[model samples]
Target: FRSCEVPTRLNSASLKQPYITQNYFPVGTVVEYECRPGYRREPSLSPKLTCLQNLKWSTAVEFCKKKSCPNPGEIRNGQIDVPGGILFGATISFSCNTGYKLFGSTSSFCLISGSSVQWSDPLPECREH
Candidate 1:
């Protein structure tokens, strides 16, 4: 049972459940243990911590890492939509330039099991008259 009132002076006041001095969690509490949308990590960021009025509240934590995929070989007029060193399960579409033939694979998926992208034929232009 807690009996302390949250002091008027607050460092951060954006907390959903304001820290009530009475709510003292000895171990700890998980706040946001997920990565922000559109953002990821490699080694990953540790959970942040803060103590208010004797109670503790954790900062945003990380779950998954942003491991970019490797770059594909040079294409006559094609390019991948993924970044190098990114995690597995990533996918990228391709397209050929005008007046060029859309030959070979136009899409590739990143594989982390082998730490590389699946091999595919290069996109080349057609021999047009």
Candidate 2:
């Protein structure tokens, strides 16, 4: 059925975005959440709320939460670059001291496949140039 067919309104709790001027929304209408800093849109729950034909609103679950990562630690005979703080989606680059070669990935990133971050290759080590 068309959005005009249903007559239901989303509650204040379900209405996360403040710009929405209308309270009464039709069925199949979807509203998305605006995630805050240090947080990301959760995948397990729908990022939006939908008006259902039952004259009820679709489940508006907690859509955003902090994403974090553990310290990358220091590299022996090498220096790590983190212009941005180490957090989810942050990328780090490694450089070995002069006259030394670096082993493993030159760069790594923090991800949110789970609650923790994933690193690429083994921790980089510096070998004699």
Candidate 3:
């Protein structure tokens, strides 16, 4: 083949937008990538794959880790039941500590942020009975 054709995003984690309009690219052409929602970059920061002469794209060296939320720790006067760690789609149940009454949401879920993930509930608290 004379040149490399543009590869679609369905193959890898996903290719970033602002892709070229050309039907094909020249050898050594490089295209960048970014993680899809609910995913984040891992170990290396290499963001591109090069177009080789054989009409194929170089193997992408990208791995996407499920985005995780901040620690739900530092909780006092209450306890949380986290079956799985705080990651995208993971959930947590909140309750009061001894002699205290729950003051907010009973459950929270790790939701997707534009980049990282967020907790469904704010810093909920407990009130002393």
Candidate 4:
């Protein structure tokens, strides 16, 4: 019989839970894929797969792309430093000038939130001591 196993991808997508409990899908069955948190379906790529008569499944060209976060730029009296620019998993550090002080955490991390990227914490403020 023509059938297919649950689909899989790395760091991008995974088999929808509605289909995960099942081990196989019979011919002509359509399966759905969802991008992981912080990821989005690749442009022009299908997130759906179909079980074919060949006992195989249709191909997904690409799973997803890493979602981006709003840039955490410089503050009024402080400077922000980013080690890997502003993207998922990047840790940005903040520091006040010589005569100023920071009112929040010294660093923030770009993290996954639902299906998008978000800063772990709000940017700190710099104020005179």
Residue 20 of model 2 has an lDDT of 49
Residue pairs with backbone overlap in model 4 = none
Residue 40, model 4: Cα distance from true site in angstroms:
2.5
Candidate 4 Cα errors over 4 Å, as ranges: 8-11, 44-46, 68-70, 113-115
lDDT tens digits by residue: candidate 1, 4-101: 33322222222234333335444444332333232344354543334434453434333444434455545555444444443445655666666655
lDDT of each: 0.43, 0.61, 0.67, 0.69
Kindly report which residue stretches of model 2 are placed more than 4 angstroms away from their true locations once superposed: 1-65
Best by lDDT: 4
Candidate 1 vs 3: which has more lDDT? 3
Model 1 CA lDDT for position 59: 47
lDDT tens per residue, model 3, 16-124: 7566555767777677776766776667576666676676777665556655666565455777887867666677888778888787778877767543566667668
| Candidate 1: stretches off by over 4 Å | 1-67, 82-86, 115-129
> What TM-score should be assigned to candidate 3?
0.72
lDDT of 4 by residue, 64-113 (tens): 77667667666557688877668766777787888988888888877776
